[PDB]
Amino acid sequence: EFIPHIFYSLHQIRKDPNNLSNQLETLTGSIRHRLKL
């Protein structure tokens, strides 16, 4: 399953941009992983 994970990661992006760049980069990498699969 990639659809709910994409949704959720999308929402903690749009909820907390104030996270340090580390979390943003890691989470974007996670979304790139899910759409790659």
């Binding site: 999308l10 929402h11 903690q12 749009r14 909820k15 907390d16 941009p17």
Partner: protein, 365 residues
């Protein structure tokens, strides 16, 4: 400008994708507002999410078996326990809770987020000014001010699962129609802006500041005009209200030629062939959505509402009737004259305005 743009982008993302109603998204939303949050297991079937700030405590009961919110309770740590968080419906014995409704009747957290931002605003800016007390009492003072000034307006709190003081008029079918919403907003322009407690005195028939020592900083009392929506927009003379009291001017951004439909109707020869229209406006018409009515400006509520009502009953109907494909029709800021046949002004009663429109419709039809 980077911080202001980032905050504007964050506000846009919060509004564009509010998230689904889940316990985790409610907890994350509360934490994003700086609210302290903990989860307790009340039973094998029931979990409570409790969220707290300086004054507010919100308990959210969650049924683990049904995947649904069961109850929501607001508790204040103020000496004022009487804060109305229920919807005012005439004739229902069940006061419907705004916070519970915002989590059960809506598909997303947008309704709940807006109501929580309002409670958090009162919490952050309440001290010796208690804004929970003052905002509750203000609805009674406005209701009294209208009784004393013979204004045919109804005051309700909390309409359609949203916090606010709503000002209603009777519509053509006896249905109540919202004209304006009064609420508190953060003053983005001046953090040093002093917001005082103003009470409507029955004895003087005026607003009075009883306690000039009781103020909050960085908050404004806002009057928002509830458009039923370009023909349903309310237009004001540019000099009707001081420009310092205008919070939201709808700038027609310079790439769509929407004059007021009123001014396009002075420029476009597509009239009823029975009417010669004459413009006697001295000022430009501006679209205003939000007014600052803080402090000494509370007297303006009745004047703004009379204009909004006159503009809806008279001006908008005159424009609708003239625009549908020789008597002289003079239209000014405060008066309308149809040759020697009929006139009405802004200071006449609503019954005179209705009689003017009936006669005008009989001539134009």
């Amino acid at each position: 400008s980077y911080v202001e743009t980032l905050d504007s982008m964050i506000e846009l993302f919060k509004d564009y994708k509010p998230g689904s109603i889940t316990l985790e998204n409610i907890t994350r939303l509360c934490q994003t507002l700086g609210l302290e949050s903990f989860t307790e297991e009340l039973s094998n079937e029931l979990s409570r999410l409790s969220t707290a700030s300086k004054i507010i405590v919100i308990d959210v009961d969650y049924n683990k078996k049904q995947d649904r919110i069961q109850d929501v309770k607001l508790v204040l740590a103020s000496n004022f326990d009487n804060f109305d968080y229920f919807n005012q419906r005439d004739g229902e014995h069940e006061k419907s809770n705004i916070l519970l409704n915002s989590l059960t009747k809506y598909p997303d957290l947008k309704a709940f987020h807006n109501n929580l931002k309002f409670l958090y605003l009162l919490d952050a800016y309440s001290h010796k000014l208690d804004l929970f007390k003052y905002f509750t009492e203000l609805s009674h003072y406005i209701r009294q001010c209208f009784q004393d000034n013979c204004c045919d307006f109804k005051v309700r709190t909390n309409l359609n699962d949203k916090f606010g003081i709503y000002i209603l008029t009777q519509g053509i079918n006896g249905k109540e129609v919202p004209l304006a919403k009064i609420y508190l907003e953060e003053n983005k322009s001046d953090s040093q802006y002093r917001f005082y407690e103003y009470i409507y005195s029955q004895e003087t028939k005026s607003w009075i500041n009883e306690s000039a020592e009781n103020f909050s900083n960085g908050i404004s009392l806002v009057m928002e005009i509830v458009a039923n929506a370009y023909t349903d927009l309310i237009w004001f003379p540019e000099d009707f209200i001081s420009p310092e009291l205008i919070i939201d001017k709808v700038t027609c951004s310079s790439n769509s030629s929407s004059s007021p439909p009123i001014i396009d109707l002075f420029s476009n020869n597509n009239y009823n062939s029975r009417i010669q229209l004459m413009n006697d406006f001295t000022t430009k018409l501006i679209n205003i959505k939000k007014f600052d009515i803080s402090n000494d400006n509370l007297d303006l509520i009745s004047e703004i509402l009379k204009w909004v009502q006159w503009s809806r009953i008279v001006l908008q109907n005159v424009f609708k009737l003239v625009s549908t494909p020789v008597l002289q029709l003079i239209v000014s800021e405060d008066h309308i004259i149809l040759d020697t046949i009929s006139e009405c002004n802004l200071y006449d009663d609503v019954k005179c305005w209705s009689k003017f429109i009936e006669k005008f419709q009989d001539i134009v039809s």
